[PDB]
Structure formats: C-alpha cells, structure tokens
C-alpha cells in the first residue's frame, strides 16, 4: 500500500529565516504534492500543489521544490503569521494516506522552568479521592519530562502529562503533572517528589515536602 | 529522541570471543533494521553488515562471512554482535545504528557510542618514566622546553601533570604508538629561561589501571 | 568490487571561505551520496543524503551535488564549527565500501617551529636501556619531517614519530621523535643530531650536542 | 583521426576581468576535457577536468562548461598570478592530440617603440663577416613587423626576427632583427634601412644611415 | 607527497640511442600506470605513449610505433624511455607523468621535471662577439640605446652581462634561432645622452660549455 512520513517530528524556526521541510515517499509519484496550513481550531487550506504552483492568498515566501521520491519546501523567509503545521499529499492512487505533521516554533533564549509541589487539601481526603500534582510553567525548549518517586520508588502507570500549544505573549510552553493514589497509599507513604529535568539544568531540580513538617 | 547506549570495552584474549550488545530507545525496534561499521586505524571506516529482525534475514561482508555472528532481541529492544577468531589486526572501533524502514539504504541518521574492543597478549605493566633536563650548560634560545618520556606502559592511557597543575598553559599531550607489544608516549612544555633554574619543575605521571604513581625530580 | 576514494588527502580552509570536496567512484551508482561528521572521540552523524536533501541540524550552508560517477560538497562559508573529517557513502550494492576520508584545517600566518635535543639521563644508563629524543612544537603548515644522522649516518628503522591533533587555543600542531638504541652503540658514538626540515626555512635547522662537551 | 584546436590564437586580459576561451573538437567526446596552466620553464598541472570538476589548488575563479562539440572556460576574475597559456585535452580515443595553445597578456595603455639602426664595426670587416640589426624596445601591442629595403629592394630571405617573452617590470616586449650580407654585398650598397610599422603611427618610422657621411 | 625526478639532459649523436629514467616517489606504482609526453617546438604538446605494469601492456602513437620503447622497473619504483634513430627535429621537451587508477583517462595531476634532450651534429665552438656603438656623429634621439651582437655558439646558452652587474634596469636578454647549425641572439640596453660617451660601457659574455670569457670595449 502507499505510506508516506515526514521529517523530523517537529521544527523551531524563527521569523526571518529559511525553513527546510521535507516528506518522503515509498514509492513515486512523479507528479504530485501538496501543502496545508493548519493552526489551532481551524481547517486547512490549500498552499503549494503539484510541488511548484502556489495557490491564491499566498506570497513568494513559499516555494516548492523536488523530484522523484524526494520532495522539499523552502520558506524563505519566515513571517509570523505562519505559524502553524504542515502536511503532504499524494495522488498517485486511492486510497489516499495523508502525512504525519510537523510542528513549528520560534527560537529564543533557554529558560529556566519553574517548579512547586503542593500537598492535597483536607476536603479530599473525605471525598475517598487523593491526588498530588506537580507545576511547569515558562520553559523552553519543548523536551522535558517528569517522573514520580516515592520514598523512591517508581509510580507507573498512572502518571498523567497534559500540553500546552504556543503562548501568544511570552512565547513558551506550559504543562501539568498529576499523579492518582488512593486512600491506603497516602497513609503508609511520607515524602512526596516530583523532579524536572531540563537541558539549561546539570542536575534535576527537586521540589519536597513532608507531611509531619 | 532516538538513543542508542552501547556497553564498555572488553579485553580479550586472542582466539576467544566476544559479546557486543548495545540496547535501542526512543523508537520502534521491529519495524526497522540494525547496522554495524568497524573503524580500523588509523583512520578508516566499514561496513560490518546488517539485521532485519523480521525473518531474520541478513547480509555481510565477504571478508566477516566467517567471523562476525549477529543476533537480535525484541523483547529488550537490543542489538547483539558476535566476534570470534580475534587477532591482534582486529582491535577497532564499533558502531550501533539504526537503518531505513524495511530498506538498508537511506544514509543513517543516529549512530553508536563508539565501544571499541582491546586484545592482546600482554598483560599490564607499571610506566616507567625518566627526567630529562638541561644541559651542556646553556640553554639556548631564550625560550626552553622540557619534557619527560613516558614509556613501559599498558593499557592505553595514562595521565600526566606538570608541577601539580599548577601551570596549565604549555602542556601538550602527546599520543603513542604500538611497537613490541608496548606504549610509548610523551609530553613538552615550554618555560623561560629567566626562571631556569630558579623555580623547581618535576614530571608526575598515574596509570589508573594499575594504580601506579611515580614522582621524580628533573 | 564496488571501490572509491576521495581526493585530495586533506585541506585547510579557514572561517568564511568556500570548501570544495570530491569522492569519486569507479562505477555509477546515479543516486545515493552521504557526508558524515566526525570529530575527535564523537561518533559520525548524518548531514547530506541523496547528495542533495540535507539532514536535519544542518545549515543551509552545507550544500551537495554532482551527476554519475562525479560527486562534490559545497560549502559556503565555514564556520568554526565545521572542524573535523568527511567520508562518503555508497548504497549501489553490498558489501558498502566507505570513503578514505580527509582531514580540514585552518588557515593562518606560517610560524617557524622551535627544535631541540637532549641527552639522556643518568637512571637510564643503568635500567639497560637508552633514548634520545628531539622535540617540535608550534609549527604550520602539516608538511615536515625528521632524521637521525648519527656520525653521519641513517638510523632505519627504529625512528618513531608521534603527531598531535588541532589545538584549540593557537591552532598549530606538534609532535616527537624518540630514537631506540642499545648499550653498545651509546659507547662507540658521540654526535647525536636531529633535524627539522620545515618549508619557511632554506637550510634544516640542526640541533647537537656532545658527551664530553 | 581525432583533431582539434583552439581559438583564437593569444588573447590579452588585465587583472579582474573575465576571460572566455574556447577549443572545438572535430568528433563528439560528450566527457572529457582538461586545462593545463604552463609558465615559462616550468611544467603544467592540471586544473579543470571533465569540463566541471577543478583539481586541487585552483581557486574557484576557474570555471569550465560546454557540452558535445562546445567547450569553453570562464575566468572570472584574472589575477596576476594567472599569467601563461592553455591548452586542452581529449580522451575519446588513442593517441591523444593536445591543443596548439594560446598565450595571455595584459592590457595597458599603447606605447610607442623606440628604434634604431647601427652600422657594423671595424673588426669584422677583416674577420669575413658583416652584419646590420635593427633594435625595437617598449611596444604594445604585439602585432609588428620589420622589413629591410637595402638601395629600394626587399632582402629575403636571411632576416631573422627573435621576439621576448612578456616583461615583469613595466610590462612590454622586445625583438631584435639582424640581416646578414657577405662582403660583395657591402662593398656596392651604401644605404641600410629598416622600417618599425605599429599600430599608433600613421606612417613606418624610418631609420637610415650613410657610409660616406 | 608526490614527487617523480627526472635525469639530466644528453647529447645524444644523430641516430644513436638515448636512456631516459624518471624515478618516481609518495604513492604506490604498480597499481597506477605511466604517460609520456613530448612538447615539439616552438609551442606545441604531443602524447608519446603510456605503459601499465600490471603485464605489461602499452600502446603508442601511430608515428611513434617504430621509435619509442618503454620498460618499467618496479624495484627501484621508476619507469624508463627509450627513443632510437633520431633526427635533427627530434630535440624537444619530455615529460614523466603518473595516470590514473588502472585507467588512461582522468587527466594526471603531476608532471616532470621537464628534462630535454640535445641531438645535434655540431661540436662546441666559442662566441664570437663585436662591440656595436654610435655613429654618424650624432646620437638620436635624448635616449639611446647600445647593444652587443653575440653569434657563432654552442650549445644553448651563454651568459651575458653589462658594466660588470652595475647596471641590472635596463638589461633586456633575447633568445636566438636556429640557422646553419648555429646559434645567433643579441642584448639590448639604454641610457641617457648626458652621460655618453663619457661613461665607459662593455659588453661581457661567458659560455659555460667551453669555459671560454671575451671582453671588449665598445
């Protein structure tokens, strides 16, 4: 069957510089391609089709490139209006299978994220409910992750991570960590941690508390 | 994020074997294919060969056909190499990195760490290291160097220092080369004359291997 | 066989100017072509496949061409993050036979080594064994080498020679020779002479030294 | 049998314009072409092979093209270093026929030679021989030429021409020309004049002499 | 490095033989071969023939096919040439060039040295010189010019100098021609009016060949 993906998973580019974005095929077209500007909760619309027409609406900045198996699009420059992600086409036979997505951002200065640890309140604990969460906010760039150790020991699975897209003001990322336990768990357990590991950072930053202090 | 760890450098003896194995992370294992390249010195670079853990099928180079022995594992996600018949031309460099998707071609994005392999049959031996100084009784010109040879030693490396570390600016660090089965190294540093022989200056050289130190004066 | 080389042995190209490399292949493979970085004690990656697409954390600096059996890299300009060696890539048929490789450098001012030799300590005489050994430093361009006349005569083999990568900090080379001999030739011989034959210099500049002296 | 030549025959380029020069071949190689730099008393390397790829040593300002029958190489720009003659190479088939060759120069602004004939000394009047020459110094272009009219009639053959190469410091050439006559031929004529016709002067300067005055 | 030396050049009498060896250096011989090629007067060039030591297999020009004979000696790492009956136009300009890798194309990199070679039969004789000056009483124009006809030697070349080195400006060297087996070049030189003829000036040649120095004045 025709399968196709794109690389790499996800691409930062500020505005006023050239973007290199590329989608591969198994097997050859020789003709076809296409390119779609998707941002958040609206629907895609038609850019550069057949590798090298561009559709109406869009500038000079977009052009399309490639022969073959191999296809490009070069941005040149970028604006910030294009924020957003990209996808291929293909019209070589039905059923037609889409491309992957690739996600844009902007370049900047590293920052260094922010990070608390809040123990549950005591309306909670008469609910048969408990939970611990653990805030990120302010962080650049996108790979991060957490992880949950009590009294050292691994919690998995159970742990859940939720997103946030692009900030419009600031211009960084935003996420949550909450971690579900049940009432026998947080009688026998103490000491409560959750760590972020970032990359302007040489060591876990660790947040703690207890429940006799 | 796609991350190949490989294991630490083994010693063997030649005519026995080997086990190389170095697990897979951040994709999905099965769906893609295994390559190994081996750099031999000083400067070289081949192509091993390669397993698709679908079958298994595989291919190899017509000079390891009766040497190297491939084996996958997909319930760790890991990739394993066998070498056998190891000889004292053998010593290099080994590589783990991921191909296309069901296709050897497509040039490989991620590779190794880089674990190498040492065999021989000499067993380690403690540095024996000498003070070289001036002179016929000038220094000439205005600038001298020292240095100290280091000699007798195995395994490769050791590590030298000049006054404790004091003076880290004009040390140079000098690799060695292989010759009856024994390492040869050694080091220059550049001082001025105005100082020579005023200030003391000594040679301090540790093999970590056999926790051998020796200090001397010059 | 499917067998290649690259041309030429090295090159030295400061920051800010045009590289041009070739490998060329004696059959045609009409498609597949890789450039790898690789750095001192740093495994390779992936920078230019198809001899076209570039990989992904590469510039637009980094660009490749070439038709049939004659292949080429471009780059404009380099940078002083571009220091290391390159190989190519054939994907024609198996077994894949690798490039040669070539090694870069960087332009600059000629710098006249500095040369010395000295004799051997008194603690040596005594453990059976006996070196000279005749030190350089600080010198450019790659191109030198050293002998060994002892009372007018070559001393081959034995003559080992030791060379030192790029120094980060005033971008020369250097090296050693350490002469091997026996206890019987250090007491029928005196003159022990090296010598630096360097292209900024008309005549080998000769460093000796006598025992009785 | 293979044949081919260049065209034209020497050209004249300052130092930073473009140089267009081009060799046609009878039969098609549709590969292979080369240009060899020689200078006076030294042998030539190579430079641009395959019409494309340049070898080692030669800066980008070379640049060759053509294709079938159709070569050509671009300069762009000339350096004073670039001095000597080109040639071009053909591998189609054996035995190879190299290029005739053309020469380079450099513009100037025109200059006027000086001429000046001197009659022959007293001792070879008594040795056998007798001799006239006529020297010609400082002139560009290098189109000229020199005729000798002994009492209104032409002498050929027997004059010889001897022409320099191109002039480091002020950039000009020379010739010298002798005309050689027996004795008999002495004896009965008295006039001996020779004409330097160039480019900036509207008629030939003349230059004579008398034996009685 | 690669470097290929070349001989000196020979005088060779028309229709003997001639021995030409270039030895060659910094690279592998018999996996490459070897070309040859003879630069005809005045300017032209001209492909002798090339030889591959892997047999030894060779092919030669058509007119050269009665001529030239190659052999190659692999021990000293040097390739030979030899040339038979030759011919009063045969003199010209040889080269020692290395091809490519089991091919003829792909134009060589390197060349010879350049070693000609003299076939004549015409011995030595010494130059004669005579001194040329002013005139018919008057000396036009503000700038004039000397020079010394120097005719009957052999071989190429002599030596020529002016006021004993004093003056190096305005010294301009002419090459010769070829007429009745022998040689006939000149000199040119200018000074200003003001100083002549109160100034002495010479002409000076010496001929290495016969170890023959005329001075004279003018």
């Known amino acids: 069957d025709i399968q196709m993906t794109q690389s790499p998973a996800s691409l930062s580019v500020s505005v006023g510089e050239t973007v290199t974005i590329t989608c591969?095929?198994?097997?050859?077209?020789?003709?076809?391609?296409?390119?779609y500007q998707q941002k958040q909760g609206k629907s895609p619309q038609l850019?550069?089709?057949?590798?090298?027409?561009?559709?109406d609406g869009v500038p000079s900045r977009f052009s399309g490139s490639g022969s073959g198996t191999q296809y490009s699009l070069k941005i040149n420059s970028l604006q910030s209006e294009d924020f957003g992600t990209y996808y291929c086409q293909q019209f070589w036979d039905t059923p037609f299978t889409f491309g992957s997505g690739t996600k844009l951002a902007i370049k900047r200065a590293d920052a260094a994220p922010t990070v608390s640890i809040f123990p549950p309140s005591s309306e909670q604990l008469t609910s048969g409910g408990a939970s611990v969460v653990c805030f990120l906010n302010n962080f650049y760039p996108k790979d991060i992750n957490v992880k949950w150790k009590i009294d050292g020991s691994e919690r998995q699975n159970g742990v859940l991570n939720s997103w946030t897209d692009q900030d419009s003001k600031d211009s960084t990322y935003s996420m949550s960590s909450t971690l579900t336990l049940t009432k026998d768990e947080y009688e026998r357990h103490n000491s409560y941690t959750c760590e972020a590991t970032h990359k302007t950072s040489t060591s876990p930053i660790v947040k703690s508390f207890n429940r006799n202090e | 994020e796609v991350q190949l760890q490989q294991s630490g450098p083994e010693l063997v003896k030649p005519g026995a074997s080997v086990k190389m194995s170095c697990?897979?992370?951040?994709?999905?294992?099965?769906?893609?294919?295994?390559?190994?390249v081996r750099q031999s010195h000083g400067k070289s670079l081949e192509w091993?060969?390669?397993?698709?853990?679908?079958?298994?099928?595989?291919?190899?180079?017509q000079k390891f056909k009766g040497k190297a022995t491939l084996t996958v594992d997909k319930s760790s996600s890991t990739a394993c190499m066998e070498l056998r018949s190891l000889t004292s031309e053998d010593s290099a460099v080994?590589?783990?990195?991921?191909?296309?998707?069901?296709?050897?071609?497509?040039?490989?994005?991620?590779?190794?760490?880089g674990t190498s392999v040492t065999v021989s049959s000499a067993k380690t031996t403690p540095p024996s290291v000498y003070p070289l100084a001036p002179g016929c009784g000038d220094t000439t010109g205005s600038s001298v160097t020292l240095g100290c040879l280091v000699k007798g030693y195995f395994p490769e490396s050791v590590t030298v220092t000049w006054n404790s570390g004091s003076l880290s600016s004009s040390v140079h660090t000098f690799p060695a080369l292989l010759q009856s089965g024994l390492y040869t190294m050694s080091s220059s540093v550049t001082v001025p004359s105005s100082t020579w022989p005023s200030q003391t200056v000594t040679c301090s050289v540790a093999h970590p291997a056999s926790s051998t130190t020796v200090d001397k004066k010059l | 066989d499917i067998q290649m080389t690259q041309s030429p042995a090295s090159l030295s190209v400061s920051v800010g100017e045009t590289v041009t490399i070739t490998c060329?292949?004696?059959?045609?493979?009409?498609?597949?072509?890789?450039?790898y970085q690789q750095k001192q004690g740093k495994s390779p990656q992936l920078?230019?496949?198809?001899?076209?697409?570039?990989?992904d954390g590469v510039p637009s600096r980094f660009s490749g061409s070439g038709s049939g059996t004659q292949y080429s890299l471009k780059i404009n300009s380099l940078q002083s993050e571009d220091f290391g060696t390159y190989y190519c890539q054939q994907f024609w048929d198996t077994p894949f036979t690798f490039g040669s490789g070539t090694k870069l450098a960087i332009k600059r001012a000629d710098a006249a080594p500095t040369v010395s030799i000295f004799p051997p300590s008194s603690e040596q005489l005594t453990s059976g064994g006996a070196s000279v050994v005749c030190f350089l430093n600080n010198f450019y361009p790659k191109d030198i080498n050293v002998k060994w006349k002892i009372d007018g005569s070559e001393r081959q083999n034995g003559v080992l020679n030791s060379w030192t990568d790029q120094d980060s900090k005033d971008s020369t080379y250097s090296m050693s020779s350490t002469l091997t001999l026996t206890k019987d030739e250090y007491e029928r011989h005196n003159s022990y002479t090296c010598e630096a034959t360097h292209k900024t210099s008309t005549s080998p500049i000769v460093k000796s030294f006598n025992r009785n002296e | 049998d293979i044949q081919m030549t260049q065209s034209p025959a020497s050209l004249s380029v300052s130092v930073g314009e473009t140089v267009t020069i081009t060799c046609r071949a009878s039969?098609?190689?549709?590969?292979?072409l080369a240009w060899y730099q020689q200078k006076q008393g030294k042998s030539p390397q190579l430079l641009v092979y395959?019409?494309?790829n340049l070898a080692d040593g030669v800066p980008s300002r070379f640049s060759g093209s053509g294709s079938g029958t159709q070569y050509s190489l671009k300069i762009n720009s000339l350096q004073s270093e670039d001095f000597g003659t080109y040639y071009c190479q053909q591998f189609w088939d054996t035995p190879f026929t190299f290029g005739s060759g053309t020469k380079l120069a450099i513009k100037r602004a025109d200059a006027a030679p000086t001429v000046s004939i001197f009659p022959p000394s007293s001792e070879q009047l008594t040795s056998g021989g007798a001799s006239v020459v006529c020297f010609l110094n400082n002139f560009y272009p290098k189109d000229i030429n020199v005729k000798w009219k002994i009492d209104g009639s032409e002498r050929q053959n027997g004059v010889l021409n001897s022409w320099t190469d191109q002039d480091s410091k002020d950039s000009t050439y020379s010739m010298s020309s002798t005309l050689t006559l027996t004795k008999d031929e002495y004896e009965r004529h008295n006039s001996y004049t020779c004409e330097a016709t160039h480019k900036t002067s509207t008629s030939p300067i003349v230059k004579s002499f008398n034996r009685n005055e | 490095e690669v470097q290929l030396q070349q001989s000196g050049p020979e005088l060779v009498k028309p229709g003997a033989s001639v021995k030409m060896s270039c030895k060659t250096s910094?690279?592998?011989?018999?996996?490459?071969?070897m070309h040859w090629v003879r630069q005809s007067h005045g300017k032209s060039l001209e492909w002798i023939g090339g030889?591959?030591?892997?047999?030894?297999?060779?092919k030669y020009n058509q007119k050269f096919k009665g001529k030239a004979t190659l052999t190659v000696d692999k021990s000293s790492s040097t390739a030979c040439m030899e040339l038979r009956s030759l011919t009063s136009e045969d003199s010209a300009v040889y080269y020692c060039?290395?091809?490519?890798?089991?091919?003829?194309?792909?134009?060589?990199?390197?060349w010879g040295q350049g070693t000609s070679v003299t076939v004549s039969s015409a011995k030595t004789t010494p130059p004669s010189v005579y001194p040329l000056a002013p005139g018919c009483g008057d000396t036009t124009g503000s700038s004039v010019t000397l020079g010394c006809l120097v005719k009957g030697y052999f071989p190429e070349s002599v030596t020529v100098t002016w006021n004993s080195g004093s003056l190096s400006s305005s010294v301009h060297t002419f090459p010769a021609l070829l007429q009745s087996g022998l040689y006939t070049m000149s000199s040119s030189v200018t000074v200003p009016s003001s100083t002549w003829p109160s100034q002495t000036v010479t002409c000076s040649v010496a001929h290495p060949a016969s170890s023959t120095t005329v001075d004279k004045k003018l």
């Open positions: 030889i591959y030591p892997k047999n030894d297999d060779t």
């Open positions: 395959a019409a494309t």
């Open positions: 910094g690279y592998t011989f018999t996996e490459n071969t």
């Open positions: 039969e098609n190689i549709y590969s292979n």
């Open positions: 060039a290395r091809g490519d890798y089991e091919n003829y194309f792909y134009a060589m990199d390197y």
